[PDB]
Design a protein around this motif. Structure first.
Motif, PDB file in Angstrom:
ATOM      1  N   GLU A  59       0.906  -1.496  -0.343  1.00 47.06           N
ATOM      2  CA  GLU A  59      -0.410  -0.084   0.236  1.00 47.06           C
ATOM      3  C   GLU A  59       1.008   1.124   0.001  1.00 47.06           C
ATOM      4  O   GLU A  59       2.052   1.124   0.312  1.00 47.06           O
ATOM      5  CB  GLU A  59      -0.871   0.146   1.185  1.00 47.06           C
ATOM      6  CG  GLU A  59      -2.175  -0.762   0.809  1.00 47.06           C
ATOM      7  CD  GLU A  59      -3.029  -1.224   2.623  1.00 47.06           C
ATOM      8  OE1 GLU A  59      -2.399  -0.333   3.844  1.00 47.06           O
ATOM      9  OE2 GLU A  59      -4.355  -0.317   1.832  1.00 47.06           O
ATOM     10  N   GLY A  82      -4.972  -1.303  -1.610  1.00 49.65           N
ATOM     11  CA  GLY A  82      -5.774  -0.267  -1.013  1.00 49.65           C
ATOM     12  C   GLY A  82      -5.858   1.052  -2.193  1.00 49.65           C
ATOM     13  O   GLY A  82      -6.075   1.115  -3.227  1.00 49.65           O
ATOM     14  N   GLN A  83      -6.629   2.017  -0.815  1.00 53.46           N
ATOM     15  CA  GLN A  83      -7.245   3.522  -2.252  1.00 53.46           C
ATOM     16  C   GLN A  83      -5.434   4.192  -1.789  1.00 53.46           C
ATOM     17  O   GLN A  83      -4.599   4.417  -0.695  1.00 53.46           O
ATOM     18  CB  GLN A  83      -7.681   3.411  -0.752  1.00 53.46           C
ATOM     19  CG  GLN A  83      -9.084   2.383   0.042  1.00 53.46           C
ATOM     20  CD  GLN A  83     -10.437   3.572   0.331  1.00 53.46           C
ATOM     21  OE1 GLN A  83     -11.158   4.053  -0.473  1.00 53.46           O
ATOM     22  NE2 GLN A  83     -10.586   2.623   1.246  1.00 53.46           N
ATOM     23  N   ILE A  84      -6.026   5.561  -2.080  1.00 49.94           N
ATOM     24  CA  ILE A  84      -5.136   6.643  -2.092  1.00 49.94           C
ATOM     25  C   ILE A  84      -5.630   7.162  -0.789  1.00 49.94           C
ATOM     26  O   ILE A  84      -6.429   7.508  -1.072  1.00 49.94           O
ATOM     27  CB  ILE A  84      -5.312   7.500  -3.599  1.00 49.94           C
ATOM     28  CG1 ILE A  84      -5.153   6.337  -4.715  1.00 49.94           C
ATOM     29  CG2 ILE A  84      -4.472   8.779  -2.793  1.00 49.94           C
ATOM     30  CD1 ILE A  84      -6.213   7.194  -5.734  1.00 49.94           C
ATOM     31  N   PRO A  85      -4.076   6.914   0.400  1.00 48.22           N
ATOM     32  CA  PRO A  85      -4.368   7.981   0.881  1.00 48.22           C
ATOM     33  C   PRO A  85      -4.618   9.771   1.118  1.00 48.22           C
ATOM     34  O   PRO A  85      -4.623   9.899   0.059  1.00 48.22           O
ATOM     35  CB  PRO A  85      -3.173   7.972   2.152  1.00 48.22           C
ATOM     36  CG  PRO A  85      -2.274   7.389   1.095  1.00 48.22           C
ATOM     37  CD  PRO A  85      -2.900   6.766  -0.645  1.00 48.22           C
ATOM     38  N   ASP A  86      -5.519  10.198   1.919  1.00 45.67           N
ATOM     39  CA  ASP A  86      -5.655  11.544   2.229  1.00 45.67           C
ATOM     40  C   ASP A  86      -4.661  12.257   3.227  1.00 45.67           C
ATOM     41  O   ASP A  86      -4.906  13.104   2.359  1.00 45.67           O
ATOM     42  CB  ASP A  86      -6.988  11.327   3.455  1.00 45.67           C
ATOM     43  CG  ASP A  86      -7.881  11.354   2.854  1.00 45.67           C
ATOM     44  OD1 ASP A  86      -8.569  11.188   2.107  1.00 45.67           O
ATOM     45  OD2 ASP A  86      -8.951  10.798   4.337  1.00 45.67           O
ATOM     46  N   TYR A 105      -7.681   1.133  -5.207  1.00 46.32           N
ATOM     47  CA  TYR A 105      -9.516   1.248  -5.901  1.00 46.32           C
ATOM     48  C   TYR A 105      -9.932   2.697  -5.130  1.00 46.32           C
ATOM     49  O   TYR A 105      -9.012   3.156  -4.062  1.00 46.32           O
ATOM     50  CB  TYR A 105      -9.502  -0.067  -5.582  1.00 46.32           C
ATOM     51  CG  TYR A 105      -8.696  -0.325  -4.065  1.00 46.32           C
ATOM     52  CD1 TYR A 105      -9.854   0.039  -3.004  1.00 46.32           C
ATOM     53  CD2 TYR A 105      -7.730  -1.958  -4.575  1.00 46.32           C
ATOM     54  CE1 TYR A 105      -8.713  -1.303  -2.196  1.00 46.32           C
ATOM     55  CE2 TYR A 105      -7.457  -2.496  -3.576  1.00 46.32           C
ATOM     56  CZ  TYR A 105      -8.313  -1.618  -2.586  1.00 46.32           C
ATOM     57  OH  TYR A 105      -7.584  -2.983  -0.609  1.00 46.32           O
ATOM     58  N   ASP A 107     -12.237   5.422  -4.243  1.00 47.08           N
ATOM     59  CA  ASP A 107     -12.679   7.166  -5.014  1.00 47.08           C
ATOM     60  C   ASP A 107     -10.865   7.643  -5.272  1.00 47.08           C
ATOM     61  O   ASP A 107     -10.030   7.465  -4.137  1.00 47.08           O
ATOM     62  CB  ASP A 107     -13.430   8.120  -4.135  1.00 47.08           C
ATOM     63  CG  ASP A 107     -14.948   7.114  -4.380  1.00 47.08           C
ATOM     64  OD1 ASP A 107     -15.042   5.647  -4.739  1.00 47.08           O
ATOM     65  OD2 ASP A 107     -16.064   8.460  -4.701  1.00 47.08           O
ATOM     66  N   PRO A 109      -9.463  10.238  -3.038  1.00 46.42           N
ATOM     67  CA  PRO A 109      -9.563  11.518  -2.572  1.00 46.42           C
ATOM     68  C   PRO A 109      -9.734  12.600  -2.543  1.00 46.42           C
ATOM     69  O   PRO A 109      -9.896  13.726  -3.514  1.00 46.42           O
ATOM     70  CB  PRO A 109      -9.136  11.496  -1.783  1.00 46.42           C
ATOM     71  CG  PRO A 109      -7.691   9.911  -2.391  1.00 46.42           C
ATOM     72  CD  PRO A 109      -7.944  10.100  -4.160  1.00 46.42           C
ATOM     73  N   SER A 111      -9.083  15.527  -0.682  1.00 46.01           N
ATOM     74  CA  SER A 111      -7.500  16.253   0.141  1.00 46.01           C
ATOM     75  C   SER A 111      -7.284  16.506  -1.108  1.00 46.01           C
ATOM     76  O   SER A 111      -6.007  16.994  -0.613  1.00 46.01           O
ATOM     77  CB  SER A 111      -7.182  15.463   1.431  1.00 46.01           C
ATOM     78  OG  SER A 111      -6.162  14.219   0.680  1.00 46.01           O
ATOM     79  N   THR A 129     -12.692   4.023  -8.494  1.00 35.92           N
ATOM     80  CA  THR A 129     -13.924   3.904  -8.444  1.00 35.92           C
ATOM     81  C   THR A 129     -14.834   5.094  -8.165  1.00 35.92           C
ATOM     82  O   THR A 129     -14.751   6.129  -7.352  1.00 35.92           O
ATOM     83  CB  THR A 129     -15.000   2.587  -7.729  1.00 35.92           C
ATOM     84  OG1 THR A 129     -14.530   2.335  -7.044  1.00 35.92           O
ATOM     85  CG2 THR A 129     -14.774   1.428  -8.852  1.00 35.92           C
TER      86      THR A 129
END
Lengths: 523, 367, 42
Positions: A59, A82-86, A105, A107, A109, A111, A129
């Motif tokens: 990640e 994982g997600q793109i961190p804020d 994956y 949204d 973010p 920020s 997404t």
């Protein structure tokens, strides 16, 4: 302290052993030497992180936001999920963010809107997404927006288009619905507009003529209906890709005035009517793709007046009449494809003037006459398809000296006489199909010199004689289709030496003996 | 097809004022063009200059550069009777100059004027009000001080106004521009209430007033903007209460009030009912009180909900158990009290994007 | 109204052999070139 952040960043990369051995806090203490870490020589603070294509697999740690001085981040090619961190929005000085070619994956973010210095946002080819959010219209100096190859939904808000600074807009291959907005003309500094392959509906805006800064306009492979508006004529684009929608009506003759066109693609629509002859005024266009519509009428001889055309595809339409000798003028034509129309008459001899032609496909017409012998002059030909016409006469012997032919398909005509031995000289030929003709005489043993050949089909002729021993030499041949002639004799046993041979057909001749025990029935 | 000679020498002048003298050697400017000039012919086959741009707007397709040490905006621009757009982008000159008043003398034709990041000093010249066919005015990121000239009310057909990133003081303009679509004044020093005249700009699709000193409440009339997609009032000194109805605003995808530290009210349950398209709600650090209302559960498009740093009390509505679409939810730094209704799917998916820390009452079970 | 092929004859400032050359990124766009340096088309 920034080193603690970098250690958490490493602690969330999955598959890593000797990858960042540089990042060794035991004793590799100057982190400005670590692999992919770059410091500015004044502050000696982390400003640029490049780890492109190391395939680290984990990640993105939230500790990425603990390097505030970061101006550039490139984590592309790391199969990161994982997600793109804020906390990515805490790098206030960030100019360049490239997270492409990963498995991220969720949204985009919120920020990200906090990065007021950002110029490049590259998130292409992941699994993101959600909406293309309106918060990216609060990045004042954003210039390149690549979001292609994700699963973004929602429509394209017309607010996006109120931006004087944006250069590149890449939304290809998402799943975006809605229409194209008139406000699209407010992107006044943009040269690249790409929404290919979404699920956009509606019509082409008639105000599209106002987008005169576009160099590339791609709205291909959506479901856009309506006609191609007259104001398409005002664009200064080099590449106009409209292929693959539900566009109807005729091609607008104003397209004849778009001499800046380098590539015009109108293919696979529901365009009807004739090919406007004014299109020959495209003296500078290198590509013309009208295939897969319902265009009628003849091939305009004016297409000979496009001096720089290299790719002409008019196949799969409803075109009638003659193949213009005028195409002898197109000195740069690399690929001509007229398949599946209602063309009649003979191939013009002047077509041998296309000295650089690589592919000639006229399959599925009503063409006639004989192969004009001037064809010997087409020493560039890689691919020749005259199949499914009404061609007559002998196969020109000279066809054998077209050195770099690898696909030769004359099947489904009325070719008579005998196979010219010179075909055996085509050492690069991969497929030779002469099926469904009236060829007579014997199966040339000089096919034994077709070293590359993979498929020989001469079924449904009047071929007499024996099957030559020499085909036993052909080491790449996997289909020998010889059915429905009048071959006689025993099947030679040297067809044992055909390793890759996997498909044979000799039914309906007058062969005799037992099938040699060179039986490689792997299929 | 040749260029009007007077316009030709104006062009020469301007290019010399900018540092690009190689233009003077060009015989006919509208025939020998460079990226950064556009011409058009009249009905007697004379070319007139219609667009003039400078600066490298990322250098892929760059405009003529400027000598950083000695360049300036040339008075000879006044001779281009047909100039419809003018563009200056990171073109830095001898000193930081002021915007010149003589720009106003192109009022018949100037349709777009973009003076972006040129370090312009002083007040906005009054006489730019004389550009009454302008659709695009942008003076973003300079060092402009003073007030937004009142004469801006004579832009009857303006489409987009960008004055953000300056030191502009005084009030939000009280104009009514029926066709204005973008209003961007963020990061200035503007003061006063939000003039309610603003909600007579029905074409508005974006209002960015964040990072100013605007006071007073949101206009109750705000329902009227049917086309507004984004509204950003962050970091101002707004006071409550929330407008009773928000239901007219059925294009709103984003509303951000973050940073109005004395906003101080409740989120009533009929405030956000029926906001089909609403995707982003940022009410954070704004001194919200009361309970988190439950209509916020039934916002179909809502993806981002930030409510942290408030005095929100009560228990987290049980409806928040069934919200599948949110990617960010911030209730941290409040005083919420009960158990936590979030179902496993939700906690697993959201991970650290669901934030509930610094709530002393909160009864935690599994996440 | 139409379009025309960009004329680069004076598009490279004060570089003289300014001539048009095409670019692929596949779709296609034009640039002006003089002594190996790139410039944008008018």
């Amino acid at each position: 302290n920034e080193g603690k952040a970098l250690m958490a960043i490493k602690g969330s990369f999955s598959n890593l052993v000797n990858m960042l051995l540089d990042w060794d806090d035991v004793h590799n203490s100057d982190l400005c030497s670590w692999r992919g870490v770059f410091c500015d020589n004044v502050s000696y603070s982390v400003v640029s992180l490049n780890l492109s294509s190391l395939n680290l697999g984990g990640e993105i740690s939230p500790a990425i936001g603990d390097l505030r001085n970061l101006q550039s981040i490139d984590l592309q090619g790391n199969k990161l999920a994982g997600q793109i961190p804020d906390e990515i929005g805490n790098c206030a000085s960030l100019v360049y963010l490239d997270l492409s070619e990963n498995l991220l994956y969720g949204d985009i973010p919120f920020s990200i809107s906090k990065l007021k210095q950002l110029e490049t946002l590259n998130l292409k080819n992941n699994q993101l997404t959600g909406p293309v959010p309106a918060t990216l219209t609060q990045i004042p100096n954003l210039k390149r927006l690549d979001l292609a190859g994700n699963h973004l939904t929602g429509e394209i808000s017309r607010l996006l288009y109120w931006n004087e600074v944006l250069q590149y807009l890449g939304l290809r291959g998402n799943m975006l619905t809605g229409t194209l907005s008139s406000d699209m003309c407010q992107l006044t500094g943009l040269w690249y507009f790409d929404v290919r392959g979404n699920n956009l509906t509606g019509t082409i805006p008639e105000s599209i003529g106002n987008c005169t800064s576009f160099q590339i306009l791609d709205i291909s492979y959506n479901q856009i209906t309506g006609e191609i508006p007259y104001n398409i004529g005002f664009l200064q684009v080099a590449t106009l890709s409209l292929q693959g929608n539900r566009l109807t009506g005729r091609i607008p003759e104003v397209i004849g005035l778009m001499q800046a066109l380098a590539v015009l693609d109108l293919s696979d629509n529901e365009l009807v009517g004739p090919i406007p002859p004014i299109l020959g005024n495209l003296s500078f266009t290198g590509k013309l793709y009208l295939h897969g519509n319902m265009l009628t009428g003849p091939i305009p001889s004016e297409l000979g007046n496009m001096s720089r055309l290299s790719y002409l595809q008019l196949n799969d339409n409803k075109l009638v009449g003659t193949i213009p000798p005028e195409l002898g003028k197109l000195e740069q034509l690399f690929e001509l494809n007229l398949a599946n129309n209602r063309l009649v008459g003979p191939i013009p001899s002047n077509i041998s003037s296309c000295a650089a032609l690589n592919q000639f496909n006229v399959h599925g017409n009503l063409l006639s006459g004989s192969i004009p012998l001037a064809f010997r002059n087409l020493g560039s030909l890689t691919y020749l398809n005259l199949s499914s016409n009404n061609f007559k006469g002998k196969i020109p012997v000279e066809l054998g000296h077209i050195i770099n032919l690898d696909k030769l398909d004359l099947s489904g005509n009325n070719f008579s006489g005998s196979i010219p031995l010179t075909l055996g000289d085509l050492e690069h030929l991969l497929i030779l199909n002469l099926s469904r003709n009236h060829l007579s005489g014997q199966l040339p043993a000089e096919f034994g010199n077709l070293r590359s050949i993979q498929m020989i089909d001469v079924s449904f002729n009047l071929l007499s004689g024996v099957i030559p021993t020499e085909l036993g030499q052909l080491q790449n041949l996997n289909s020998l289709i010889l059915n429905n002639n009048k071959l006689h004799g025993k099947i030679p046993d040297q067809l044992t030496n055909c390793f890759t041979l996997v498909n044979l057909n000799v039914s309906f001749n007058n062969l005799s003996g037992i099938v040699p025990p060179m039986a490689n029935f792997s299929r | 097809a040749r260029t009007e000679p007077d316009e030709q020498d104006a062009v020469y002048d301007i290019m010399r004022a900018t540092g690009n003298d190689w233009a003077a050697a060009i015989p006919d400017v509208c025939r020998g063009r460079w990226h950064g000039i556009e011409c058009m012919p009249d009905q007697d086959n004379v070319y007139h200059v219609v667009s003039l741009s400078f600066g490298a707007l990322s250098d892929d397709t760059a405009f003529p550069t400027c000598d950083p040490q000695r360049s300036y905006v040339s008075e000879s621009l006044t001779r281009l009777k047909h100039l419809k757009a003018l563009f200056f982008y990171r073109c830095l000159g001898r000193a930081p100059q002021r915007i010149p008043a003589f720009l106003g003398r192109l009022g018949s034709s100037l349709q777009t004027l973009v003076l972006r990041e040129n370090g312009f000093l002083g007040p906005i010249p009054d006489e730019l009000g004389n550009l009454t066919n302008l659709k695009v005015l942008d003076l973003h990121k300079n060092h402009l001080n003073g007030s937004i000239p009142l004469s801006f009310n004579r832009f009857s057909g303006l489409r987009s106004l960008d004055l953000s990133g300056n030191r502009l003081t005084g009030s939000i303009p009280g104009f009514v521009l029926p066709a204005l679509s973008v209003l961007d004044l963020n990061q200035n020093l503007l003061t006063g209430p939000v003039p309610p005249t603003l909600t007579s700009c029905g074409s508005l699709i974006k209002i960015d007033l964040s990072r100013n000193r605007v006071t007073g409440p949101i206009p109750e009339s705000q329902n009227r903007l049917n086309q507004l997609v984004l509204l950003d009032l962050s970091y101002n000194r707004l006071s409550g209460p929330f407008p009773s109805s928000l239901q007219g605003l059925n294009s709103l995808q984003a509303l951000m009030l973050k940073g109005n530290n004395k906003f101080s009210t409740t989120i009533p349950e009929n405030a956000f009912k029926g906001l089909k398209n609403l995707m982003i709600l940022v009410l954070s650090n704004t001194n919200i009180q009361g309970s988190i209302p439950k209509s916020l559960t039934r916002l179909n498009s809502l993806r981002v909900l930030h409510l942290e740093g408030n005095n929100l009390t009560g228990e987290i509505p049980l409806e928040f158990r069934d919200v599948k679409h949110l990617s960010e939810l911030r209730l941290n730094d409040n005083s919420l009290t009960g158990p936590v209704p979030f179902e496993r799917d939700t906690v697993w998916r959201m991970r650290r994007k669901l934030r509930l820390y610094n709530n002393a009452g909160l009864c935690v079970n599994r996440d | 109204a139409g379009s025309r092929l960009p004329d680069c004859s004076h598009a490279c400032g004060s570089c003289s052999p300014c001539r048009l050359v095409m670019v692929s990124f596949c779709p296609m766009a034009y640039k002006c070139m003089c002594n190996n340096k790139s410039y944008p088309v008018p």
